[PDB]
Amino acid sequence: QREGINASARYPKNWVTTGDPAREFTMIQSAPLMLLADPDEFVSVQLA
Amino acid sequence: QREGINASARYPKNWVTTGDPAREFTMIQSAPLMLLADPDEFVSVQLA
Amino acid sequence: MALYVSPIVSGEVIRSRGGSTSEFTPGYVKPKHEVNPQMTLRRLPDEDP
Amino acid sequence: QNLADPAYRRRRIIMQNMRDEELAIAQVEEMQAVSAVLKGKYTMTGEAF
Amino acid sequence: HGGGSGFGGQLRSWNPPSESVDAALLPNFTRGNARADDLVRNNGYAANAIQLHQDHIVGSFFRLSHRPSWRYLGIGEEEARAFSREVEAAWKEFAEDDCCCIDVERKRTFTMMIREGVAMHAFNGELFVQATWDTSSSRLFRTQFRMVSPKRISNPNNTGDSRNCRAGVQINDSGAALGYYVSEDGYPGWMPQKWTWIPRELPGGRASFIHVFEPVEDGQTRGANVFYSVMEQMKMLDTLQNTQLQSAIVKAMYAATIESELDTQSAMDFILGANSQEYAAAPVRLGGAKVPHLMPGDSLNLQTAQDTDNGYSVFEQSLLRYIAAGLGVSYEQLSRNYAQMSYSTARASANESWAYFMGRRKFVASRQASQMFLCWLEEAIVRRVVTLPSKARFSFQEARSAWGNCDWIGSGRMAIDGLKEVQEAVMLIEAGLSTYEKECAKRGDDYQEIFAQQVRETMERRAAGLKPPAWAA
Amino acid sequence: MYTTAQLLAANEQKFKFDPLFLRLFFRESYPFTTEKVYLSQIPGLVN
């Protein structure tokens, strides 16, 4: 949010923790909400 | 201390903590010690 | 996957990668032969008379 | 025969990590699509969520 | 074979982490600038190098000479030169203005603009200038210029850099910058730092903000000062000279010593005379020889100290030679030492340094002044202070570069002998292989006003009726 | 320990995966600004 990218597909992020043990990270964040207009448009049937 | 500006009125600082709950914190530090040269110059009376 | 972690409780990470080896040292072949100049006297099937 | 410096190793590890992370996010996002056009119902359910 | 490992391992543990120059520079970009500022403020050598830059890249004056692309625009010579002289007269009136109102800071002239720009390009790697347009109508021209230190350009809230956001430089996919972020004054650091975004170019086509530096590879965004290759060397050199000075101080401080079992006061008054008759121990008056009479078992061991320049001078010679190599300036110019110098060697050194400085001038000051003149001329045209010829095939906005074709005249080449250069120049002119314009540009003038001044001179001499000058018939 | 053992191959053989649905059915992407999403359907049925 610090850079006004509130809406985005994928957000990379990296940071290294302090302290005696050193270790950094790679972060990806997203909130996908794949939807569709008409569910009745498609017909899905299991077979046997 | 490392910025060498340790002498003024109001010090602002906003910083972000690391890790997943990465959150910002805003800060206004000060050490105000205002004073008057002559206390006896000003005369106070408790009206009754 | 990292399926649906709520954005407060990120939690754990996953192992990076890695691991495999193999060793097969040289192979080798050396099919020698010979000359023996004595056989050179009688002619071969070719080399018509 | 030719080793690599620790910094180069860590850069390569970062490459592997970011690639697997994007693969995982693609894998998780296609789940919405397959649930949608398989039954129209979808359950965004996961531990710690 | 050379780049693999090194002979017998040798550089068996060294392998630089190959990356772009921006990736190498940005993480410690602030640190390098801080170290460079500290060096230029506390070290005499850095200050002298910067002063040489200021004196030689631009020097005392910086003249304009606008030669428009009249042939490209299909313009006639007469109106082309009329327009040129009018615009240059306007520019010279506006530039050396005694108001000192050219800038918002109101505390420098245009020559100081050029000097500050080249100096900050040298010791910071680049220069930033914002052209503002004030609303006050008190003066003819409403354009002012503000130079900004690179320390004031950074991403908002000191955020992490990205593909299209590097050090607060908004760029496109191709790498061309489109916007900048500027932080206001931070004195004291007790006001909340704020970021303002300024587009590089005004949508109307005006260069609202100009950023000048010399990239060395693809993808460059910021410049690197010349000190990066010599900063640690010069810092440690200053430390070494300081420590050597202090060591010599203490060596000269302790000269002799006395050895005796007796009381200290008695030893003083018996060996050094002292003033026992009157924790300062005992001061000693300075007089004649004062030969003592130390009793047996005593000693007056006078130390021989140690030479204060045990190769120090020549070691400094070599180190300053390396520093000059790094900084581009010649060693004699940098170190102000000129021993055992021959005419040919001095001429060669001057030629090399002058070529380098001409390159630096052309690649910093010429273009910065050209951009400033372009903005000023855009304002002048939009205010119609001069009349553009109607026959002009292309509009001003269409042919901005063509209309703004102008060169610059800096400080001339002051030859060591002078007589030789003047005689060679005049014989070259006689041979006709050069031009008065080229000669005056080299020497720091222009043939047009030279001829005007000569016409004035001959008119005055004719009126006085004393002697015609050396240009008649 | 004369085991220099130079290496030549780094085969992956990782995984088989291609969505084809997002490019076959969801060809349009949409960022969100609000927290809530409204999706409406109008039914047309008349006697």
Curated annotation (Swiss-Prot), chain E:
Entry's localization field: Virion
GO cellular component: viral portal complex
Keyword terms, alphabetized: Capsid protein, DNA-binding, Viral capsid assembly, Viral genome ejection through host cell envelope, Viral genome packaging, Viral long flexible tail ejection system, Viral penetration into host cytoplasm, Viral release from host cell, Virion, Virus entry into host cell
Post-translational modification: Proteolytically cleaved by the viral protease during capsid maturation.
InterPro entries, alphabetized: Phage_lambda_portal
Keyword match Nucleus: no
Predominant location: virion
GO molecular function: DNA binding; structural molecule activity
One matching Pfam family: Phage_portal_2
GO annotation (BP), single: virion assembly
Highest taxon, organism lineage: Viruses
Family, as annotated: Belongs to the siphoviridae portal protein family.
HAMAP family xrefs: PORTAL_LAMBDA
Function: Forms the portal vertex of the capsid. This portal plays critical roles in head assembly, genome packaging, neck/tail attachment, and genome ejection. The portal protein multimerizes as a single ring-shaped homododecamer arranged around a central channel. Binds to the terminase subunits to form the packaging machine.
Subunit and partners: Homododecamer. Interacts with the terminase complex composed of two small and one large terminase subunits.
Name the UniProt record assigns to this protein: Portal protein B
Lineage: Viruses, Duplodnaviria, Heunggongvirae, Uroviricota, Caudoviricetes
Curated annotation (Swiss-Prot), chain F:
Record-given protein name: Major capsid protein
Residues of the full protein shown: 3 to 49 of 341
Family: Belongs to the lambda phage major capsid protein family.
Compartment list: Virion; Host cytoplasm
Tree of life domain: Viruses
Subunit and partners: Homomultimer. Interacts with FI protein.
Role according to the record: Assembles to form an icosahedral capsid with a T=7 symmetry. The icosahedral capsid is about 60 nm in diameter and composed of 415 major capsid proteins. The assembly is primed by the interaction between capsid assembly protease and portal dodecamer, and major capsid proteins assemble cooperatively to form the procapsid with the help of capsid scaffolding protein. Major capsid protein forms hexons and pentons of the icosahedron. Viral genomic DNA is packaged into the procapsid through the portal vertex.
Naturally occurring in which organism (per UniProt): Escherichia phage lambda
